[PDB]
Amino acid sequence: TLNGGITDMLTELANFEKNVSQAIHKYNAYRKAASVIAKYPHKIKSGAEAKKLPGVGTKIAEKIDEFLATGKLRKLEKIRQDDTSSSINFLTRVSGIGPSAARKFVDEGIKTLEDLRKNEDKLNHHQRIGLKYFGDFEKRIPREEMLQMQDIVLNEVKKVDSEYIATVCGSFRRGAESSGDMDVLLTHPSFTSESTKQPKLLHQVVEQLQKVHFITDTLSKGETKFMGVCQLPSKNDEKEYPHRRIDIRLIPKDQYYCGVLYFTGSDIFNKNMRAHALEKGFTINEYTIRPLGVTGVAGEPLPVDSEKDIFDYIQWKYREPKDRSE
DNA sequence: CCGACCGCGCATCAGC
DNA sequence: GCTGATGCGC
DNA sequence: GTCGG
Ligand SMILES: Nc1nc2c(ncn2[C@H]2C[C@H](O)[C@@H](COP(=O)(O)OP(=O)(O)[C@H](F)P(=O)(O)O)O2)c(=O)[nH]1
Ligand SMILES: [Cl-]
Ligand SMILES: [Cl-]
Ligand SMILES: [Cl-]
Ligand SMILES: [Cl-]
Ligand SMILES: [Cl-]
Ligand SMILES: [Mg+2]
Ligand code: NA
Ligand code: NA
Numbered sequence: 105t106l107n108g109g110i111t112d113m114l115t116e117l118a119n120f121e122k123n124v125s126q127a128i129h130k131y132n133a134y135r136k137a138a139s140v141i142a143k144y145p146h147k148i149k150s151g152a153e154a155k156k157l158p159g160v161g162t163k164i165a166e167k168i169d170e171f172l173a174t175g176k177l178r179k180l181e182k183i184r185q186d187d188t189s190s191s192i193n194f195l196t197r198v199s200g201i202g203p204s205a206a207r208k209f210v211d212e213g214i215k216t217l218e219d220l221r222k223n224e225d226k227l228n229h230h231q232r233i234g235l236k237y238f239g240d241f242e243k244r245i246p247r248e249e250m251l252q253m254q255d256i257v258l259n260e261v262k263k264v265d266s267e268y269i270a271t272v273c274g275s276f277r278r279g280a281e282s283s284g285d286m287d288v289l290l291t292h293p294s295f296t297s298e299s300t301k302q303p304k305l306l307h308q309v310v311e312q313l314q315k316v317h318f319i320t321d322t323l324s325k326g327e328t329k330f331m332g333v334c335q336l337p338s339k340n341d342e343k344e345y346p347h348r349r350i351d352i353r354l355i356p357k358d359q360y361y362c363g364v365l366y367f368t369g370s371d372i373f374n375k376n377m378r379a380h381a382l383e384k385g386f387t388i389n390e391y392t393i394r395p396l397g398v399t400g401v402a403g404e405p406l407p408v409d410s411e412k413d414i415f416d417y418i419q420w421k422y423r424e425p426k427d428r429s430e
Numbered sequence: 431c432c433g434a435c436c437g438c439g440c441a442t443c444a445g446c
Numbered sequence: 447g448c449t450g451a452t453g454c455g456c
Numbered sequence: 457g458t459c460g461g
């Protein structure tokens with residue numbers, strides 16, 4: 105937070121471009137800038153100093169001067185004053201409601217928490233659950249609770265089949281003292297890039313977790329990706345914990361490393377690394393790293409036996425999880 | 431300039 | 447039913 | 457909104 109004022113401003117701007125303007129590239133532009141600046145080990149003294157960093161162009165440079173000078177940005181002040189932008193921004197905070205749905209709702213006169221509640225009829229399943237736990241999903245999860253959640257998940261998975269391997273990724277794997285949710289990578293020997301010898305692999309796990317009342321709701325669920333809600337069990341007479349978002353990703357056992365690299369993130373770190381890969385002539389997804397041919401087409405998967413091998417391919421020194429928080 | 435900006439699973443819809 | 451595009455999210 | 461060729 106050495107330059108918290110600036111990164112917050114930029115993040116607010118990114119959110120604006122994304123939710124209201126629906127200008128995803130501008131959104132990422134602001135995010136990257138915010139990211140490179142949050143990483144800057146100095147208290148920025150001017151937009152010019154900031155422009156030296158890659159990702160900070162002329163536009164952001166001027167805004168940083170305005171911010172440093174007056175402690176604010178007129179562009180944002182006006183944005184906050186605009187009722188439609190504010191309503192749209194607010195609705196996009198409900199899981200399941202994106203820029204389009206948000207603007208649509210606002211067009212229908214549905215602009216507040218109260219409006220959503222008296223209009224469940226107009227929401228799809230995901231949006232419905234997102235509204236239900238609106239407040240809870242806003243809360244952070246202390247690492248202490250992430251540790252309790254981890255323990256339940258690994259043990260419950262073990263009970264279903266001893267060969268399952270569940271790895272908690274996301275900010276948790278990066279050493280964060282608090283996480284926005286829980287991310288679980290799952291593998292089983294019977295499921296490889298080569299074949300699927302057992303059906304319902306992800307289902308059995310989800311099922312077991314619902315059985316012990318850890319998983320409470322489902323936002324979306326497929327053969328390899330579960331997106332839902334969970335809650336730690338509370339003791340007698342004590343207030344129950346907030347409900348939490350949980351994502352479970354089943355990846356081919358032989359593609360673990362690409363999978364854990366992907367799920368560990370951060371999201372921006374992934375974007376930068378994938379972008380660098382391309383420049384180096386490779387393409388990286390959660391399953392493999394493949395070279396790009398002369399035609400610019402993905403070739404066959406390259407051999408990977410550790411997260412480091414992926415880093416070596418694109419000529420990047422290895423970065424531990426804790427240093428990938430961009 | 432000007433195009434590139436990561437890559438993909440699930441839910442939903444239109445069009446057949 | 448299917449396929450493909452879109453929205454949304456990670 | 458920013459960057460590289
Ligand atoms: N390539 C790519 N990868 C993405 C993207 N979004 C999320 N990811 C990856 C990396 C996250 O760590 C991981 C989990 O997604 P996440 O949204 O839970 O992020 P996270 O790192 O856990 C956050 F810090 P928190 O949840 O604690 O607030 O999913 C994306 O847009 N592109
Ligand atoms: Cl854009
Ligand atoms: Cl401001
Ligand atoms: Cl791998
Ligand atoms: Cl692949
Ligand atoms: Cl680490
Ligand atoms: Mg997470
Ligand atoms: Na710059
Ligand atoms: Na949302």
Ligand code: NA
Binds near residue numbers: 274286351
């Ligand atoms: Na998540």
